């Protein structure tokens, strides 16, 4: 329901090359709008949505500076993390951070977050109150004390309540013709052979935005998600999304099943069945 | 706009 601005950072160690790679991407809701890649020659923050291109040179210059500095600290940090976990230099390891703000209906911060992971495991996270940290193990406790001594939480809280929300608001207006116009799914049902005593009915939702959607199968109003195949919502490639839900039903019994679609761009729930 | 401040594990 509420809009969000989020950034996703990935740093990976490369032992063979004796260096690391840092990749940052930025999103408004389900729409990517910037990237940074330390591996790119002369790396800069680059536009990845058309509406962000109207930002001036000061924006691209200053965003690029931020990422270059962040890239270096995440590279050095990979070295620390290997020492914390008694790891050799032979293996590759992965450090991630994500952070963002959700826009409340009053224009205030609904919820902000800042979290970190190492080799796919929660490492440290800013608590809901935006004033303290939770560390996952004895290694993360080293980081927590460093950040407490340096008062890092106050800066993260200031960013999340302030610049994050005001940036979100500026971006939503700049790209309002796409970011604030919900595209409803194009829906249909198909039938396919399955096995003895059973044909498959597949309910398609195609070309919708934003990503959140509800696809359910009902047999006389009763939810069938137990025997249902529900695929992960997937990108269309043009900024919209797709999803389907499929169910095996008895032959001749097709018309006793209904597919129900809920989407923000529909404004009224839909029912449909096999034709 | 990205968060600026020094980020050191």
């Amino acid at each position: 329901g509420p809009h969000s601005l989020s950034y996703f950072y990935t740093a990976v160690s490369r032992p063979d090359r004796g260096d690391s790679r840092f990749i940052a991407v930025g999103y408004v809701d389900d729409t990517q709008f910037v990237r940074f890649d330390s591996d790119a020659p002369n790396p800069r923050m680059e536009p990845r949505a058309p509406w962000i291109q109207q930002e001036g040179q000061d924006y691209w210059d200053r965003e690029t500076r931020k990422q270059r500095d962040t890239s270096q600290t995440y590279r050095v940090g990979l070295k620390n993390l290997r020492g914390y976990y008694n790891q050799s230099e032979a293996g590759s390891h992965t450090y991630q951070s994500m952070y963002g703000c959700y826009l409340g209906p009053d224009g205030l911060l609904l919820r902000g977050y800042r979290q970190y992971a190492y080799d796919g495991a929660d490492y440290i996270a800013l608590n809901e109150d935006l004033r303290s940290w939770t560390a996952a193990d004895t290694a993360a406790q080293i980081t927590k004390r460093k950040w407490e001594t340096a008062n890092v939480a106050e800066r993260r809280r200031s960013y999340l309540q302030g610049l994050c929300v005001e940036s979100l608001r500026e971006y939503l207006e700049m790209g309002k013709d796409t970011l604030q116009r919900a595209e409803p799914p194009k829906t249909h049902v198909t039938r396919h052979p399955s096995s003895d005593l059973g044909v498959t009915l597949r309910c398609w939702a195609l070309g919708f935005y934003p990503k959140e959607i509800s696809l359910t199968w009902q047999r006389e109003g009763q939810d069938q998600s137990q025997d249902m195949e529900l695929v992960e919502t997937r990108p269309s490639g043009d900024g919209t999304f797709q999803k389907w839900a499929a169910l095996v039903v008895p032959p001749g019994e097709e018309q006793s099943y209904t597919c129900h679609v809920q989407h923000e761009g529909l404004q009224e729930p839909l029912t449909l069945r096999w034709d | 706009y990205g968060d600026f401040f020094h980020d050191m594990v």
């Binding site: 996703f8 990935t10 991407v25 890649d37 590759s92 796919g120 495991a121 695929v231 490639g237 | -």
Partner: protein
């Protein structure tokens, strides 16, 4: 603790022969991020674009590999994925029903 990739192969629009389309291979839920995702035409690697590395709320990564294609009645398409969690490459064929 490494997580294996899930793979979907699909067209941007419902396929009709002789009409230009887009072919997508969406690979998600994997960790670590090192991966190789090839879209294949009759077994041969296509020079398809790859999205910027991103990840989900559970820290697992996702990538979209995609390219233009005009489906017909003969050409066969698939997606081939190699990841440290797979002892053999994972291959998913494209059909118009999924």
């Amino acid at each position: 603790v490494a997580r294996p990739p899930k793979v979907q192969v699909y067209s941007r629009h419902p396929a009709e022969n002789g009409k230009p389309n887009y072919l997508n291979c969406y690979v998600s839920g994997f960790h670590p991020p090192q991966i190789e995702i090839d879209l294949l035409k009759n077994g041969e690697k296509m020079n398809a674009e790859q999205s910027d590395l991103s990840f989900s709320k559970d820290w697992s990564f996702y990538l979209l590999v995609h390219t233009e294609f005009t489906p017909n009645a003969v050409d066969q398409y698939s997606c081939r994925v190699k990841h440290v969690t797979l002892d053999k490459p994972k291959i998913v064929k494209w059909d118009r029903d999924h």
